[PDB]
């Protein structure tokens, strides 16, 4: 059946997702809820606890935190790249188009996965070794005080949909295979792959969330929402790189942010 094939694709993506991302939502929610068996994460809720944690997990704290997020982003880009390479048909696409899909899609994926590590009170850091409170993050001096708040707002709404890792693997794959990214040289093959992924996502949601009315439509809207989140983030970065000095940007991020 065409449906049977869609389930095999869904499973292939889930398995690849597990191989590519060390900290899954399943593992993360276990930590956030306490069910975890491992050692509890070190909580950073103020300047003093951040100092203590710099030992457990020159520049002012706000910059150190900001750049810490950037370094985590670099790590995430590499993980996402490995995942993209597992999506059937991806490595056979024009190499320049693969670069384009990642360049314009990684941040949307980063924010999708970050939600898996967040709750209304804070976010897991360094793969669950720490938990930084939302309260502390917005206490940072401007413009850093509102750096993550929009991501927390998105995550609370996104997490209310109760997706699991199996749903997420397909959701992320659909986003990466967006045929409308600027500068793509061969759109058709990307669209054909995405159309198949979309069919797999729809079936996945109907089977995994039988009572969740219009979940597919809602996810399509979250995809649009994520692009708006990235737009704002990019806008804030330019405000920072306009008022802050001596700050260094990781070359991988410099490449992604260029002409973006």
């Amino acid at each position: 059946p065409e449906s049977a094939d869609l389930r095999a694709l869904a499973k292939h993506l889930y398995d690849s997702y597990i191989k590519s991302f060390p900290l899954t939502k399943a593992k993360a929610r276990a930590i956030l809820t306490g069910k975890t068996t491992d050692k509890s994460p070190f909580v950073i809720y103020d300047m003093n606890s951040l100092m203590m944690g710099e030992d457990k997990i020159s520049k002012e704290v706000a910059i150190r935190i900001f750049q810490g997020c950037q370094f985590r982003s670099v790590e995430a880009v590499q993980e996402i790249t490995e995942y993209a390479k597992s999506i059937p048909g991806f490595v056979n696409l024009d190499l320049n188009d693969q670069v384009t899909l990642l360049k314009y899609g990684v941040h949307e994926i980063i924010y999708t996965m970050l939600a898996s590590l967040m709750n209304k009170d804070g976010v897991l850091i360094s793969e669950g070794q720490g938990f930084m409170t939302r309260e502390f993050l917005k206490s940072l001096r401007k413009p850093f005080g509102d750096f993550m708040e929009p991501k927390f707002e998105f995550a609370v709404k996104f997490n209310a949909l109760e997706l699991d890792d199996s749903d997420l693997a397909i959701f992320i794959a659909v986003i990466i295979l967006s045929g409308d990214r600027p500068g793509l040289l061969n759109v058709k093959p990307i669209e054909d792959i995405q159309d198949n992924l979309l069919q797999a996502l729809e079936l996945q949601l109907k089977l995994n969330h039988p009572e969740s009315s219009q979940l597919f439509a809602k996810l399509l809207q979250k995809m649009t929402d994520l692009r708006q989140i990235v737009t704002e983030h990019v806008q804030l970065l330019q405000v920072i790189k306009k008022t802050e000095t001596d700050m260094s940007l990781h070359p991988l991020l410099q490449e992604i942010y260029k002409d973006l």
Binding site: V77, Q78, T81, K85, V91, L95, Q98, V99, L102, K103, P251, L252, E255, I256
Partner: peptide
């Protein structure tokens, strides 16, 4: 580019 290099590493 760096993204290209990451994409090429098997």
């Amino acid at each position: 580019s760096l993204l290209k290099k990451l994409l090429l590493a098997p």
